[PDB]
Design a protein around this ligand. Structure first.
Ligand code: SAH
Ligand code: SAH
Ligand code: M72
Ligand code: M72
Ligand code: HF2
Ligand code: HF2
Ligand code: CA
Ligand code: CA
Ligand code: CA
Ligand code: CA
Ligand code: CA
Ligand code: CA
Ligand code: CA
Ligand code: CA
Ligand code: CA
Ligand code: CA
Ligand code: CA
Ligand code: CA
Ligand code: CA
Ligand code: FE
Ligand code: FE
Lengths: 332, 333
C-alpha cells in the first residue's frame, strides 16, 4: 500500500542522515556520553563541545528519526537501537566519513571511460580513525586468542600493513624485549608510526620500513626479516588477490621470513548467498565499495583453497563476531 | 525490542545509506527510466549498453534491493514494492547525496564553532542544479500553473528571480506567445546556460537575462526593463531573503523596482514545526538539518505569512504543495 511505501521511502531518506550522524556523534563524543549516562542535555553538550547548536539538534534529530536516540524536551535519551548502533559506530563512520565520497560519486565512478588514474577519493585520515576501533572491537579477541595459542615465545615480530604501529606496540607490551618491524607501503603511515612508537617509549625496540607486501622480496630491511619468528597481517590481506598474485605473494612471504613459525592473518571476506533484504551491517558497503574501486575481495573459501599452493598450512581458524564474514587464520 | 530486531534495524540503516545514494545514481545513469518502461531489466545488458563497470552495477542494484526498491531475479532486476515511491522522489535522493552529500559527510568538522568561517563546507553545484531542475517541475509545477491560471490577466512581461536554467521563462513563453521574459540570476553560470538554452529553443528574441542579486534588486541596473514587468515570479530561493529584517527590506525593494507588477508568485519550501521524529517525511530532515549546518536561515510558513504586509505586499491566495516537506506558493499583490 501507498502509506507503507511512503513511510519506507521516508525512512530510507532519513537513514541516510542518521547514518552519517552515527559516525559524527562518535567522533564528537556524544555516543560515549549517552552510553555512560543514558542521556544528555543538548544545549549543555553544544556548549561543552563548542558546537553550533542548531546543527547539533539536527544531528540528534537524525538519530532519533530512525530510533537510535529519543528527544525529550531539552534532553536526548538512548533509544531502542542505541546499543546496536553504538556497537557498530565505526562501521558507520567508515561508510560515511571514510568512504562517503566514493559512494556519493557513483554516477562518475561506474562509467568505464572514467576508470583510469585516480577515479575515486577516500578520506584516509577518516578511514584510519575508523580502522583503529574496527581493529580493536572486532579483531582483538581472535588476535589475542591466536597469540595465546602460538606455542612459543616470539623474539622478532613483523607486521604487514603496520599502519599506526598500534599492533606492534601491543605485542611489545605483551612480550617485553620482543623486537618489532612494521612494513607499510605508505610513507605517511611510516612517519606516524615512528612518531607514536617514539612517544610511547618503544623507539629502540620497534622499527618501520616502507615496502609493498605484495613484492616483499624487494623490501630492504637490514637483513632483519630473517630474524622474524612471528608474522602478522591484519585488515589488508585482500590486497594480495587475485588468486595467482596471492599464491606468489604467499610464496614470497614464506621465502623472505624463513624463520617464521606462525603467520596470523586477519581480514574481512566477500560473503556468498546472503538474501538482499537480509544483508547484515557492513557487508554491502565493503563489497560494493571494493567493486566500485575495482579491487578484488576473496571469499573465505578462496582463502582456504590458496594456502597450500602458497606454501602455508592453516592450523586454526577463528570466526569474528558480526563484521560481515571476517576470520583470523593461524598459518604455519 | 529484542536484540534481533535491533540488529535488523541497524543493518537497514546502514544499507539505506547505500540504497539512498543509489537512487540518485540510478536516476542519473538511466536505470530508473528503463525499469519504468518495462518493469524489469537485464543487469549485464544494462551495463554493456551504458559502458559501465558491471560488478559496480551489480552492487548498485543490490543496494536498491537491500531495502525493497528493486528485486533481483537471476540476471534480471525487477521493480520492487517501493519502486514507484522511490522513483517519484528520486530527485530528492539525488539532492541529498550527489548534491549535498559532502555537507553531511563532514558533520564532525562542520559542527565545531571554531571551523565555521570562510568556506567551511562544500556543495556540488552542478549536481544540485541537476536535481533542482526536476524538483522544480515535479513538486512546484501543479501549484505554479494553478496560480498562473488564476492571474485574472494576461501577462505581457514576466520577470523570474533566481531564473537558473531559464526553464520557467520558456514554459511561460510557450503558454503566452509573444510574452517577454526577463531572468535575474546572481550566477554567471546560470545566465550563460539559460541564454544558450533560450537560443536553442528559438526564444532569444523574447527572453533575456541579467546578472543580479534579488536580495538587493535596487543595485541591479536593469534599465526600466523592470518597469514593463507585470508578472513577477520567484521559486525555490525565497528563503535567501531572510532573516526577517532583511526579508522586509528586500520585499519593499522588489515592490519599488517592479512598480507595474500585478501578481508576484512566490514558491518555496519552509521549515516545519512539531513533526514527531519518527514521522518525518521525505526531504524535511535534510532540508532543515542542511540549512542549520550551513548556518542558512529557513523560515516557517507562519514567518512568511507575518512578513508580507510590512514588506509592502498583500497575500491573496496560498497553495499547499504535495509534499515536499511543507512547501507553498503564495500569490501576492
Ligand atoms: N600492499 C601493501 N603493503 C604494505 N602495506 C599496505 C599495503 N596495502 C595497504 N597497506 C597498508 O595497510 C594499512 C591498512 S590499515 C589496517 C592497519 C593495521 N594492519 C591494523 O590492523 O590496524 C595502511 O597503513 C596501508 O598503508
Ligand atoms: N540572491 C539571489 N539573487 C539572484 N539569484 C539567486 C539568488 N540566490 C540564489 N539565486 C539563484 O537562484 C537559483 C536557485 S535554483 C532555482 C531555479 C528556478 N527558480 C527554478 O525553479 O528551477 C540559482 O540559479 C541561483 O543562482
Ligand atoms: C583500511 O581498512 C579497511 C578495512 C575494514 C575492515 C576490514 C578490512 C579492511 C578497508 O578500507 C580496506 O582496507 O579494505
Ligand atoms: C538549490 O535548490 C535547493 C532547493 C530544494 C528544494 C526547495 C528549495 C530549494 C536547495 O538546496 C536550496 O536551498 O537552494
Ligand atoms: O581450510 C580452512 O578452514 C582454514 O583456512 C584453516 C584450517 C584448516 C583446517 C583445520 C583448521 C583450520
Ligand atoms: O497569511 C497567509 O495565509 C498567506 O500569506 C496568504 C493569504 C492570506 C489570507 C488569505 C489567503 C492567502
Ligand atoms: Ca540531562
Ligand atoms: Ca523511538
Ligand atoms: Ca556525482
Ligand atoms: Ca542482521
Ligand atoms: Ca572450507
Ligand atoms: Ca529482462
Ligand atoms: Ca523485496
Ligand atoms: Ca541474484
Ligand atoms: Ca570528516
Ligand atoms: Ca570546505
Ligand atoms: Ca562536493
Ligand atoms: Ca546586484
Ligand atoms: Ca511519510
Ligand atoms: Fe580494501
Ligand atoms: Fe537554501
Amino acid at each position: 500500500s501507498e502509506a507503507q511505501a511512503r513511510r519506507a521511502v521516508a525512512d530510507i531518506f532519513n537513514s541516510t542522515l542518521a547514518s552519517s550522524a552515527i559516525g559524527a556523534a562518535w567522533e564528537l563524543g556524544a555516543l560515549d556520553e549517552l552510553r555512560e549516562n543514558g542521556k544528555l542535555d543538548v544545549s549543555d553538550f553544544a556548549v561543552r563541545h563548542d558546537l553550533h547548536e542548531p546543527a547539533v539538534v539536527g544531528m540528534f534529530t537524525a538519530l532519533a528519526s530512525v530510533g537510535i536516540v529519543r528527544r525529550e524536551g531539552a534532553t536526548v535519551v538512548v533509544g531502542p537501537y542505541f546499543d546496536e548502533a553504538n556497537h557498530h559506530r565505526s562501521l558507520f563512520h567508515w561508510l560515511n566519513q571514510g568512504s562517503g565520497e566514493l559512494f556519493r560519486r557513483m554516477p562518475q565512478v561506474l562509467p568505464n571511460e572514467n576508470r583510469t588514474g585516480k577515479f575515486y577519493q577516500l578520506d584516509a585520515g577518516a578511514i584510519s580513525y575508523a580502522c583503529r576501533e574496527i581493529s580493536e572491537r572486532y579483531f582483538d579477541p581472535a588476535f589475542w586468542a591466536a597469540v595465546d595459542g602460538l606455542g612459543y615465545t616470539p623474539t622478532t615480530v613483523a607486521d604487514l600493513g603496520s599502519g599506526s604501529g598500534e599492533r606492534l606496540i601491543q605485542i611489545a607490551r605483551r612480550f617485553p624485549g620482543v623486537r618489532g618491524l612494521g612494513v607499510d607501503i605508505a610513507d605517511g603511515a611510516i612517519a606516524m608510526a615512528e612518531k607514536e612508537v617514539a612517544a610511547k617509549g618503544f623507539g629502540d625496540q620497534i622499527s618501520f620500513v616502507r615496502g609493498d607486501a605484495r613484492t616483499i622480496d624487494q623490501v630492504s630491511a637490514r637483513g632483519e626479516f630473517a630474524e622474524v619468528d612471528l608474522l602478522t597481517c591484519f585488515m589488508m590481506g585482500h590486497a594480495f588477490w587475485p588468486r595467482e598474485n596471492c599464491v606468489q605473494t604467499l610464496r614470497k612471504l614464506r621465502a623472505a621470513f624463513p624463520n617464521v613459525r606462525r603467520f596470523l592473518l586477519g581480514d574481512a571476506t566477500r560473503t556468498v548467498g546472503i538474501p538482499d533484504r537480509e544483508l547484515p551491517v557492513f557487508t554491502l558497503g565493503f563489497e560494493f565499495g571494493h567493486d566500485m574501486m575495482g579491487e578484488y575481495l576473496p571469499t573465505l573459501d578462496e582463502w582456504d583453497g590458496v594456502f597450500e599452493e602458497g606454501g602455508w598450512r592453516c592450523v586454526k581458524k577463528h570466526a569474528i563476531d558480526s563484521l560481515s564474514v571476517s576470520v583470523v587464520f593461524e598459518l604455519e
